[PDB]
Paper text:
[name] ([name]) is a critical enzyme in the recycling of folate cofactors that are essential for the synthesis of deoxythymidine monophosphate and several amino acids. Since inhibition of [name] depletes the pool of available thymidine, it has proven to be an excellent drug target for rapidly proliferating bacteria, protozoa and cancer cells. Using a structure-based approach, a series of propargyl-linked antifolates were designed, synthesized and shown to possess highly potent antibacterial activity against both [name] and S. pyogenes.
A series of biphenyl derivatives, 7–11, probe the deletion of both propargylic and C-ring methyl groups, extension of the C6 alkyl group and the role of the B-ring alkoxy substituent. As predicted from the previous structural analysis, removal of the hydrophobic branching substituents both at the propargyl position and the distal aryl ring is well tolerated.
Residue numbers in the entry: 1 to 157
Amino acid sequence: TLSILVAHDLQRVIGFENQLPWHLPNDLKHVKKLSTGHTLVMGRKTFESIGKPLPNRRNVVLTSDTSFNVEGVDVIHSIEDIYQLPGHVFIFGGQTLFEEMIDKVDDMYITVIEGKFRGDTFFPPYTFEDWEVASSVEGKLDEKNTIPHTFLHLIRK
Ligand SMILES: NC(=O)C1=CN([C@@H]2O[C@H](COP(=O)(O)OP(=O)(O)OC[C@H]3O[C@@H](n4cnc5c(N)ncnc54)[C@H](OP(=O)(O)O)[C@@H]3O)[C@@H](O)[C@H]2O)C=CC1
Ligand SMILES: CCc1nc(N)nc(N)c1C#CCc1cc(-c2ccccc2)ccc1OC
């Protein structure tokens, strides 16, 4: 199963200056609950923003740099390599990888941030004619999670 894992705002902003424009623990909980014990495929630039690999999951980084070597990280150099990965594979970002993979994924796990932030990286546009809403769940708001958000699970028609 090949799925996109993304969090974008009302205008599909995903990042600003190599990082997330918001901190939302509920979305992090959503990521860990969903990707733990599976595989994350991310672009090279996104990994450098994180620094370390994420624990309890297989971390794959896509890069043209063949000399790439980081502790506890598997390396791939082509978009084709993704299909030769066992189990549930999550496309983790960022922009350029989302742009390439949107047309190829079966599945899509989107956290819609119900706001408008300043950003320089975006998620590709998508119509609901191509995607059916498998589930739409509102996020609960506490003192630590003050930005309204909706968890969407989208499956390709
Ligand atoms: N809100 C969210 O869900 C997320 C947001 N983001 C945000 O997005 C931004 C990152 O976007 P972006 O700058 O596009 O970063 P990316 O991680 O998507 O960059 C991808 C990089 O990997 C390499 N690469 C990508 N595709 C290929 C390919 N097909 N073949 C060979 N190499 C490839 C390229 O560099 P090279 O080959 O030279 O190494 C490229 O620069 C950040 O600002 C971040 O904050 C990121 C993830 C999630
Ligand atoms: C965590 C939001 C996020 N949510 C969703 N629904 N999909 C995603 N693909 C990402 C993402 C990302 C990429 C990303 C993640 C973390 C992070 C922070 C704390 C703990 C674990 C990871 C830090 C920087 C970063 O790049 C800027």
